[PDB]
């Protein structure tokens, strides 16, 4: 399809957590989503919230419609569960690496289904609980999913980092090593 | 031992607006797990069964002229509405890239923090645009509305030479250059 | 701050 720009409403419902998601991407970048628990519209960039508004009912009720379609499709498909698609993990920094200069490490998990993921950062082999952030379960054209995980760190030649990813398509957690 | 996949079923949908030459095209997708079974294409004007799973769904929907009339209005009701409303902060968002030249015998020109994705990175050897069998990576989405790209260059140095990386972007009046 | 439009997904025949 010919397009100068593509705007897409993407949403899903499933049995496990996250049970639902309703988002809107502009040229494959998530512009906003509806928090299904807080019942609030969350904008990706604060500049979007000052120029646009979105009634959260547009997401909550749309999730409700899909849940009905879920139960209907479960019965007609004779309870066919989809094959687990293992994820692909790549780790790269946001800015060029300079020792002592604050940076951001990006873990990109890609091409996985179902959208049920446990992702965690490891610094020198131990857990990191601060300086972390994550994106939603983003959609793909082949109806698989990808996701971003972020870690703000200070580069040092004596530090090595790992992105530990758990998924049903993996018989053992996947460690993606990265170092300067 | 363990590793038995929990019972999980998924339903997902899409609402895609394709804008081109003042025209809007609307696609609504109904997907069970990763199988698209029913689709509405505004250029077609009615629903179509993508799989045998979606034949009863597409047959009933095409029976209701009420529903069909509501989907045919979407290109003007939603696509055109959201396209004209967001024009300022999404269609015309400009972020200037930052360039960095450093070696690892390859030479890597690293471009960070740029939007949109269309960018040209050319290699020069003493003012001559010797492409020299260059290898560049695909566009890298950071997930926060910024892009990355890395362009490699096979180099064998002569002392006194200067390699220049020129970067042309829509957010730049004149090309940005950085030499090694 | 103007409001964006959305569309209701349809229920499957059932």
């Amino acid at each position, epitope marked *: 399809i010919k397009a100068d720009h593509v705007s897409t409403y993407a949403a899903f419902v499933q049995t496990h957590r996250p049970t639902g998601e309703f988002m809107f991407e502009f040229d494959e970048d998530e512009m906003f989503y509806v928090d299904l628990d807080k019942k609030e519209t969350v904008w990706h960039l604060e500049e979007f919230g000052q120029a646009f*508004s979105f*009634e959260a*009912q*547009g997401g*909550l*009720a749309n999730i*409700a*419609i899909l*849940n*009905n379609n879920l139960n209907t499709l479960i019965q007609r498909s004779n309870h066919t569960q989809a094959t687990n698609d293992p994820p692909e993990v790549t780790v790269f920094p946001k800015e060029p690496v300079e020792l002592g200069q604050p940076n951001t490490l990006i873990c990109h998990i890609d091409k996985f289904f179902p959208p049920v993921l446990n992702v965690t950062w490891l610094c020198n082999g131990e857990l990191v609980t601060e300086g972390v952030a994550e994106s939603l379960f983003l959609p793909r054209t082949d109806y698989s999913f990808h996701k971003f995980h972020y870690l703000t760190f200070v580069p040092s030649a004596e530090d090595f980092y790992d992105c530990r990813v758990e998924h049903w398509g993996l018989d053992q957690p996947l460690l993606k090593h990265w170092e300067a | 031992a363990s590793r038995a996949t929990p019972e999980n079923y998924l339903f997902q949908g899409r609402q895609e607006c394709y804008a081109f030459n003042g025209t809007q095209r609307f696609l609504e997708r109904y997907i069970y797990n990763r199988e698209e079974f029913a689709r509405f294409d505004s250029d077609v004007g009615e629903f179509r069964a993508v799989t045998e799973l979606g034949r009863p769904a597409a047959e009933y929907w095409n029976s*209701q002229k*009420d*529903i069909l*009339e*509501e989907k045919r*209005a979407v290109p*003007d*009701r939603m696509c055109r*509405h959201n396209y004209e409303l967001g024009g300022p902060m999404t269609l015309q968002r400009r972020v200037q890239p930052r360039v960095n030249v450093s070696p690892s015998n390859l030479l890597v020109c690293h471009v960070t923090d740029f939007y949109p994705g269309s960018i040209q990175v050319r290699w020069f050897l003493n003012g001559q645009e010797e492409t020299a069998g260059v290898v560049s990576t695909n566009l890298i989405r950071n997930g926060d509305w910024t892009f990355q790209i890395l362009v490699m260059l096979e180099m064998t140095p002569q002392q006194g030479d200067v390699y220049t990386c020129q970067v042309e972007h829509t957010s730049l009046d004149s090309p940005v250059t950085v030499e090694w | 701050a*103007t*409001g*964006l*439009a959305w*569309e*209701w997904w*349809r*229920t499957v025949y059932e």
Partner: T-cell receptor
Amino acid sequence: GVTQTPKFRVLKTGQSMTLLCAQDMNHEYMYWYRQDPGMGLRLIHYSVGEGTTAKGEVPDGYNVSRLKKQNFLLGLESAAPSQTSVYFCASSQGGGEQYFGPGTRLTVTE
Amino acid sequence: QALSIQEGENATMNCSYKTSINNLQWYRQNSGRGLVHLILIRSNEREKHSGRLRVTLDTSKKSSSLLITASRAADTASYFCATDKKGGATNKLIFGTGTLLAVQP
């Protein structure tokens, strides 16, 4: 094809009841209005599918339930004299024609 | 609002809305029973016909006119306007205050 049960009702202040709306047209959307002479037709609640409802113009004092696609239930927990009105149900497939029911007039007396 | 005309003549009734809309509708209520949809005009249109009815829309003034030609006894009713809101639920309508019409014999 929209049906309302009951059609008429008289209640004592503080009593409870449930208005039942039914449609056999497989419509996805259903509404509950109240009409008083001075203000016209005003929306109480509406529903775009099973399991979901949303507030309208005058929501306070009324509850709604959509456990089935065919039925849209409107409930009054503690009836008040201000709730004496005629309550209309409607169903639709979108932002086009709304198909209304016959109406239900309810009188709350002390 | 009230109005009375003689049978066989033309009736014109007016209304106004407040928000930006995608479609406007006119409704009729006889016998104090269920309201009935009459006609729907979209924001892209200026005039539309249905039976003996002709609806006129003016987006600049945010008003509309309904014209009943060769009026009959059954046209005696109250007439409402119904609009949606751009940026809101496409199926959520807001009904305006009605005007009573009496077709005298």
